[PDB]
Amino acid sequence: GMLTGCSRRDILDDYPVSGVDIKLDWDGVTDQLPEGVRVIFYPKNGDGRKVDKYLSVRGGEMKVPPGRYSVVVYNYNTESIRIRGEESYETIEAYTGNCNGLGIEGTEKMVWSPDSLYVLNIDELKIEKSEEVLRLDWKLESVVKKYSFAVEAKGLEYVATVVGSIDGLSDCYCIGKGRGVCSSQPIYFEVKKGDNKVTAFFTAFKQVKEMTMPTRMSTSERETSSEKGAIILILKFIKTDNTVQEATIDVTEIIGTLENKPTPPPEIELPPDDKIEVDKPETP
């Protein structure tokens, strides 16, 4: 392992600071609270004077000097999810690693499913010069969508293991931009095999931030581009002789059906023409 050290702002103690007090509400956000959150203030006026702090899951005091900023708040302790581009609001991106150490061919080209990420991103916040502590009341947004499905498949007796992948979903999330992005690298997921069914669970980032920013004012005509992307589910059946048979399913029109005492996963009905059948392995 290799660690990256940092220090506090040296003229944060020399220059006057009207501190802020962040309170975080998690009511109806999640019952499984994160370890804590990271808060970054990117100055708009200033030459890269970013005020950065790790806080309690409930928030806390933080000394921000006055000025116009862009803000990001996300949960730091995550398994699959990694952060890059933290130097600028416009580049801070959440991503997953490529599947390493799996025994099935082609998993190296795939990325892991993202674990839970909670984000708040304000394009513009103006901290004024104040004698008293400015009180922010924030709530974070779950930017990771969960999916599940079940599909009927003949001859699973011939299958050793099944490896699922889903192309076309957001496997990256631009925290500052508030949009998910697709790296064209499939998200890998394990598939549970029954006798006549296969069940799987996976996750992906939201295409776009759903939080309402009542104060956000855009001068550019509103953006809509979801349809310019096909969503393909791939089931890689590894046979008992280590042979592989793949099944490619286009879930573009039903992807929403798959989002979610728990509920059994939605069945992906196939025409009798496109039924999944694993052919008995060849014999000498």
Side-chain angles (χ1 to χ4, degrees), residues 179-208:
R179 269 172 163 88
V181 78
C182 181
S183 72
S184 312
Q185 293 183 106
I187 297 166
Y188 155 87
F189 54 89
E190 310 183 353
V191 181
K192 184 188 177 171
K193 71 158 176 135
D195 308 317
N196 301 279
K197 260 168 196 166
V198 293
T199 288
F201 294 78
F202 66 94
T203 60
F205 289 112
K206 274 187 181 161
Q207 210 187 90
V208 198

Side-chain angles (χ1 to χ4, degrees), residues 7 10-14 16-46 48-220:
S7 83
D10 309 359
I11 307 176
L12 188 87
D13 315 299
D14 309 332
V17 278
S18 60
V20 297
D21 190 350
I22 292 140
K23 187 204 158 148
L24 299 169
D25 192 18
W26 293 88
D27 277 43
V29 181
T30 181
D31 35 21
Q32 291 153 37
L33 286 202
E35 213 217 292
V37 304
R38 199 216 197 155
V39 184
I40 314 158
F41 276 81
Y42 302 89
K44 289 182 147 203
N45 348 91
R49 41 143 183 125
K50 70 145 191 187
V51 182
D52 179 314
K53 209 194 169 176
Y54 291 86
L55 274 188
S56 168
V57 80
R58 315 282 188 194
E61 290 239 342
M62 190 185 301
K63 283 163 185 184
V64 172
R68 287 190 316 123
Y69 299 96
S70 290
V71 186
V72 295
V73 190
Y74 67 88
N75 57 302
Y76 52 83
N77 217 41
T78 43
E79 289 303 295
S80 311
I81 299 168
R82 298 179 200 173
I83 297 301
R84 67 188 162 205
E86 52 189 75
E87 57 268 355
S88 161
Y89 182 75
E90 289 284 300
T91 57
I92 186 165
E93 182 186 22
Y95 67 105
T96 45
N98 275 101
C99 309
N100 293 325
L102 292 181
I104 305 308
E105 187 67 74
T107 59
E108 59 273 13
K109 285 153 255 300
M110 306 177 189
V111 300
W112 304 106
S113 4
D115 53 317
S116 298
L117 186 72
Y118 308 99
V119 167
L120 168 70
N121 69 283
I122 304 154
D123 288 341
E124 201 188 295
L125 183 71
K126 189 178 169 197
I127 282 97
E128 290 264 18
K129 191 190 187 180
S130 186
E131 285 288 47
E132 207 46 60
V133 207
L134 299 134
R135 281 98 194 172
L136 284 304
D137 280 76
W138 295 336
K139 184 163 263 174
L140 259 59
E141 161 187 23
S142 188
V143 294
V144 176
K145 288 197 171 104
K146 301 166 185 160
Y147 305 86
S148 70
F149 72 88
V151 62
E152 208 180 288
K154 194 179 161 180
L156 296 170
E157 63 251 42
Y158 307 134
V159 177
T161 191
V162 198
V163 160
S165 43
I166 184 128
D167 265 305
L169 297 179
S170 316
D171 53 83
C172 293
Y173 183 82
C174 281
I175 294 161
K177 297 285 285 168
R179 269 172 163 88
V181 78
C182 181
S183 72
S184 312
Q185 293 183 106
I187 297 166
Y188 155 87
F189 54 89
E190 310 183 353
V191 181
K192 184 188 177 171
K193 71 158 176 135
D195 308 317
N196 301 279
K197 260 168 196 166
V198 293
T199 288
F201 294 78
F202 66 94
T203 60
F205 289 112
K206 274 187 181 161
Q207 210 187 90
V208 198
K209 155 179 208 71
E210 286 181 352
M211 187 184 284
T212 288
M213 316 301 296
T215 174
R216 189 182 186 274
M217 285 169 283
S218 280
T219 174
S220 60

